[PDB]
Amino acid sequence: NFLVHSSNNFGAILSSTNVGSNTY
Amino acid sequence: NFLVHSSNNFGAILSSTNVGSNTY
Amino acid sequence: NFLVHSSNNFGAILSSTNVGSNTY
């Protein structure tokens, strides 16, 4: 479990339920 | 379990339920 | 289990239920 410069996400939405859910 | 610069995702939405679900 | 610069996904939506599900 050696992790050098890992877990990279760029410009991310992560662990998200409703994205843009509008006009109800 | 040696991970150098891994788990790369770019511009990502990850673990997401409803994307753009609109006008209900 | 040696992973150099692996698990790359670009511009991804991953683990996602409803994409664009609109106008209900």
Add this chain to the structure above:
Amino acid sequence: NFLVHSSNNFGAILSSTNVGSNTY
């Protein structure tokens, strides 16, 4: 189980239920 720069998917939606399912 030696993985150099593997598991590449680009522009992907992966593990996804309904894609574009609209106008219900």
Add this chain to the structure above:
Amino acid sequence: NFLVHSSNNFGAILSSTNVGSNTY
């Protein structure tokens, strides 16, 4: 189980139930 730069899929939707299933 030596995998150099394998498991490549590009522009993919993978493990997906309903693609484009619309107008119900």
Add this chain to the structure above:
Amino acid sequence: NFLVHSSNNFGAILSSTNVGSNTY
């Protein structure tokens, strides 16, 4: 030129020159 929900392509790479062209 009436187009209702047309021009659908799913999981597509379109207008593309070299796909997977590797190991030169």
Add this chain to the structure above:
Amino acid sequence: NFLVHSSNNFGAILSSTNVGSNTY
């Protein structure tokens, strides 16, 4: 030129030159 919910592409790479072109 009436377009209702057209031009749909999902999980797409479009207008792209070299996809995965690696190891030169």
Add this chain to the structure above:
Amino acid sequence: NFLVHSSNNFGAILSSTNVGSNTY
């Protein structure tokens, strides 16, 4: 030129030159 909810692309990389072009 009436466009209701058109030009939808999901999880896309679009207008892109080199995708994943690595290890030169």
Add this chain to the structure above:
Amino acid sequence: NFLVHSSNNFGAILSSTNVGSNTY
């Protein structure tokens, strides 16, 4: 040129030159 909720792209990288181009 009437556009209701158009030009939707989700999780996108768009107008992009080199994606993931690494290890030179």
Add this chain to the structure above:
Amino acid sequence: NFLVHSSNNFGAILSSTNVGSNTY
């Protein structure tokens, strides 16, 4: 040129040159 809630991109990198270009 009537645009109601248009030009939606979520989690996006847009107009971008080099994404993740590392280890030179």
